[PDB]
Amino acid sequence: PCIDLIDSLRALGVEQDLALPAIAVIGDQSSGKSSVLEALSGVALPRGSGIVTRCPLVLKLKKLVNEDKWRGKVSYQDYEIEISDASEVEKEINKAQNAIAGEGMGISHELITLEISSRDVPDLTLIDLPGITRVAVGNQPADIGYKIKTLIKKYIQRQETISLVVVPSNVDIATTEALSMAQEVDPEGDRTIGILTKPDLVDKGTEDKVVDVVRNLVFHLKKGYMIVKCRGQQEIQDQLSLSEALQREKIFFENHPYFRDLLEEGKATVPSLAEKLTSELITHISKSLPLLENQIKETHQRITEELQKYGGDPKAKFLKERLARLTQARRRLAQF
Amino acid sequence: XXXXXXXXXXXXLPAIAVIGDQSSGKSSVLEALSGVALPRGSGIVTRCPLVLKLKKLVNEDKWRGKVSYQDYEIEISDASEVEKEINKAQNAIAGEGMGISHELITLEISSRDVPDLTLIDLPGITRVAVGNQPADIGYKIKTLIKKYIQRQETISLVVVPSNVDIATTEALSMAQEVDPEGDRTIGILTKPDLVDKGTEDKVVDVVRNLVFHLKKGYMIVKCRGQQEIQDQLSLSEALQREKIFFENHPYFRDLLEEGKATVPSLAEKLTSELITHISKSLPLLXXXXXXXXXXXXXXXXXX
Ligand SMILES: Nc1nc2c(ncn2[C@@H]2O[C@H](COP(=O)(O)OP(=O)(O)CP(=O)(O)O)[C@@H](O)[C@H]2O)c(=O)[nH]1
Ligand SMILES: Nc1nc2c(ncn2[C@@H]2O[C@H](COP(=O)(O)OP(=O)(O)CP(=O)(O)O)[C@@H](O)[C@H]2O)c(=O)[nH]1
Ligand SMILES: [Mg+2]
Ligand SMILES: [Mg+2]
């Protein structure tokens, strides 16, 4: 339903005219941020040990309710390369990175644009960004750390961008540069969410502390915290199916003493976060929505006249139906 | 070499600072070397600077311990009392909550079992104020740390957990700031028992000094996990495990066998290091000997 609410809007031609926010993942080097984005997107963004996201990537996901068949494309500088298989995604994204950032461990401002259109993926915009380092290593220069922070601010400063702060459960949250960085650009936290990761790697004894953090009890966020567990590095090497990974996460929380609670509180798991985010997204649409009624109405009335002529025709079936949904929706949402 | 320091000790100074992030195990290192009960724990547990002055006795076979700050110079009559007392000091001085203070604590311990040494615990680096501290806490702390590591005497001991990508380590930057060529800098890795399975080769590299380079190079150890602190585990028992832990542990066996893992290694390592600076820093005290001699020439001038 409301998950297809957006497609209806896309049908009313207001998706261009109002598109709601993107979602950025900001946090330290190797804090699992690509792993979150991959977890939500179900697309193979490079995840790993060390320096693995080496320049910004926008992922534009679009649902298919009509043709139902896979699509994927990359774009940067000179190239708009076509990808003919989901298999190829990670391979290609690293091609892009090598090409663009220079094949070592240096990074670049230059954006990558992945656009994927599929049945299984949700309507969404996500943004991977490199991790915060505070020290240049191998072949990067002194001010790398700063370079990166500049690059990150340049995304989270936009009003559209929902900052998703990604922290591992095994670091004292007060260490978390990205929280400071977030409230800098979002003083009252209306586009900010805290994600904990690597819960499976906490020191035995310290799990109460972690819980508090997530019960939003040590550093306060307005929109509050989530916690998940992604593929550990072993599980990446073993190429584990996403669906299998999502399985474990459930098991993991389901049978984990301290953290059981956080699940039962709607505060753990990814499908939680997915849902959570959707509402976040859902809120912004609603806020924007009264200001598009003329487009929405005109459009609807323009479509109804188109299809009214095709009246008692079979070929209208698909769209005579499609319209229908749009209509019912609108009446109720407006009544709101 | 151990004796050269006793010849130096006989004539009555290098110190060693532990700098690193909040909950990175730094107090745990200093406790590991000192065998004294410095408050180590979850969250914010070193909440203002402490100088530990250790002095060997083969003479007395008597334990001694004293704390000092602001006014107080409190006597401690049992090693049992140390942690209790250090928290009393902290509460007294920093204000009970989570806020910190520049004000130094001075523990002086004299015992058989402890080495001749000077160590400095310092609070962890936070980058965000929580509960009852103010915005610029993070900076307050960094100022406080620089104020110790900037001295030439101070051997900066950077403490990193094995489960953070080393490039995240603020304290490394902070160290080269005040020690460009790395003649008083050592990297310690901790919590090796908390690495993600798969990433252990990476850790090793770090320690083989292969991802961020230090002149004096790296060590790695494992200290009481929080459970083991709640279970009050004997130090000697903890030192036992560390040996087991590395001894039977696949990737990290090597690092042991390379003299690059364990505490008794680090102890030995540091000792050599420490000796360097005495030899290095001695000319300034020959200068003070002048002062002493000229003050003494008054005694002879009086007769
Ligand atoms: N055990 C465990 N490991 C995890 C979890 N999430 C991620 N990891 C592991 O941590 C590492 C970091 O994940 P990744 O998504 O690559 O972090 P990243 O922030 O994207 C790397 P960069 O900062 O350069 O973008 C990977 O080795 C991954 O397998 C988790 O929940 N549990
Ligand atoms: N699992 C494991 N845990 C460790 C290790 N070293 C320390 N810890 C744990 O992490 C916590 C940190 O110890 P502590 O000495 O407080 O670190 P710290 O950096 O001095 C804390 P602060 O910054 O507040 O002064 C303790 O709970 C301890 O049990 C280790 O080698 N392995
Ligand atoms: Mg990444
Ligand atoms: Mg401490």
**Which domain CATH number covers A206?**
3.40.50.300
Of B68, B22, B24, B28, the residue nearest B47 (C-alpha): B22
| Contact list, B136 vs chain A (CB under 8 Å) | none
What three-state secondary structure class fits A154? Answer: helix
Specify burial of residue B259 (Cβ count, 10 A radius: 0-12, 13-18, 19+). exposed
CA distance B2 to B115: 10
Domain range enclosing B184: 1-303
**Count: domains in chain A:** 1
Of the candidates A29, A176, A204, the beta carbon closest to that of B167 is on: A29
A301 is in an annotated binding site: no
The two three-digit tokens of residue B69, written as one number: 């700050």
Cβ-defined contact of A205 to B42 (cutoff 8 Å): yes
| Contact list, A168 vs chain B (CB under 8 Å) | 163
CA distance A190 to A280: 9
Q: Does A177 touch chain B (CB under 8 A)?
A: yes
Q: Does A205 touch chain B (CB under 8 A)?
A: yes
Please enumerate in sequence order all residues whose Cβ is within 8 A of that of B155, keeping only pairs 6 or more positions apart, or say none: B14, B15, B16, B17, B184, B185, B186, B270, B273, B274, B277
> With the C-alpha atoms ordered B229, B235, B239, B241, is the resulting torsion angle positive or negative?
negative
The two three-digit tokens of residue B179, written as one number: 């020690």
At position A273, the amino acid (one-letter code) is L
CA distance B263 to B33: 7
Cα separation values, B133 from A171, A218, B98, B137, Å:
19, 12, 7, 6
CA distance A197 to A232: 10
Cβ of B191 less than 6 Å from ligand 2: yes
Cβ-defined contact of A236 to B198 (cutoff 8 Å): yes
Cβ of A296 less than 6 Å from ligand 1: no
The two three-digit tokens of residue B190, written as one number: 């901790």
Residue whose Cα lies nearest atom 1 of ligand 1: it is: A232
Cβ-defined contact of A176 to B128 (cutoff 8 Å): yes
> With the C-alpha atoms ordered B13, B19, B23, B25, is the resulting torsion angle positive or negative?
negative
Cβ-defined contact of A174 to B212 (cutoff 8 Å): no
Solved how?
X-ray
CA distance B176 to B184: 10
Please enumerate in sequence order all residues whose Cβ is within 8 A of that of A59, keeping only pairs 6 or more positions apart, or say none: A37, A41, A43, A45, A114, A116, A124, A125, A126, A127, A128
Cβ-defined contact of B23 to A172 (cutoff 8 Å): yes
Of B177, B169, B120, the residue nearest B20 (C-alpha): B169
Cα separation values, B236 from A163, B113, B118, B239, Å:
47, 12, 21, 5
CA distance B136 to B142: 10
| Contact list, B196 vs chain A (CB under 8 Å) | 198, 201, 232-234
Q: Are B51 and B106 in contact (CB under 8 A)?
A: yes
Please enumerate in sequence order all residues whose Cβ is within 8 A of that of A302, keeping only pairs 6 or more positions apart, or say none: none
**Ligand 1 atom nearest to CA at A35:** 15
Q: Measured in angstroms, how far is the CA atom of residue B27 from the centroid of ligand 2?
A: 7
Q: Are A255 and A66 in contact (CB under 8 A)?
A: no
The two three-digit tokens of residue A208, written as one number: 């109460």
Question: After what residue numbers is chain A broken, C–N > 2.5 angstroms?
Answer: none
Cα separation values, A1 from B38, B77, B117, Å:
59, 73, 70
Q: Are A269 and A212 in contact (CB under 8 A)?
A: no
List, in sequence order, every beta strand (DSSP E) within A35-191.
57-63, 71-76, 79-82, 112-118, 124-128, 162-168
Cβ-defined contact of A232 to B131 (cutoff 8 Å): no
Cβ-defined contact of B226 to A205 (cutoff 8 Å): yes
Order of strands across the sheet with A162-168?
A: A79-82, A71-76, A112-118, A57-63, A124-128, A23-27, A162-168, A192-197, A225-227
Q: Measured in angstroms, how far is the CA atom of residue A175 from the centroid of ligand 2?
A: 14
What are the residues whose beta carbon lies below 5 Å from ligand 4 (ion)?
A: B 27, 45-46
At position B133, the amino acid (one-letter code) is Q
H, E, C per residue of chain B: CHHHHHHHHHCCCCEEEEEEECCCCHHHHHHHHHCCCCCCCCCCCCCCCEEEEEEECCCCCCCEEEEEECCEEEEECCHHHHHHHHHHHHHHHHCCCCCCCCCCEEEEEEECCCCCEEEEECCCECCCCCCCCCCCHHHHHHHHHHHHHCCCCEEEEEEEECCCCHHHCHHHHHHHHHCCCCCCEEEEEECHHHCCCCCHHHHHHHHCCCCCCCCCCEEECCCCCHHHHHCCCCHHHHHHHHHHHHHCCHHHHHHHHCCCCCHHHHHHHHHHHHHHHHHHHCHHHHHHHHHHHHHHHHHHHHC
- The resolution, in angstroms to one decimal, equals 3.3
Task: Count chain A–chain B contacts defined by CB atoms under 8 A.
Answer: 122
CA distance A194 to A234: 25
At position B231, the amino acid (one-letter code) is D
Phi/psi zone of residue A180: left (φ > 0), alpha (ψ -120 to 50 degrees), beta? Answer: alpha
CA–chain centroid gap for A113, Å, is 14
Question: After what residue numbers is chain B broken, C–N > 2.5 angstroms?
Answer: 12
- Concatenated DSSP letters for A9-70? HHHHTHHHHS----EEEEEBTTSSHHHHHHHHH-S-----SSS---S-EEEEEEE-SSS---
| Contact list, B42 vs chain A (CB under 8 Å) | 205-206, 209
Order of strands across the sheet with B105-111?
A: B72-76, B64-69, B105-111, B50-56, B117-121, B15-20, B154-161, B185-190, B218-220
Q: Are A157 and A135 in contact (CB under 8 A)?
A: no
Chain B, residues 107-136, CB within 8 A of chain A, namely 124-131
Instruction: Write out the H or E segment, with its range, that includes residue A98.
Output: helix A89-101
Q: Measured in angstroms, how far is the CA atom of residue A25 from the centroid of ligand 3?
A: 9
Cβ of B28 less than 6 Å from ligand 2: yes
Residue B39: what are its φ and ψ, rounded to 5°?
Answer: -60, 115
Other beta carbons within 10 angstroms of residue B73's beta carbon come to 11
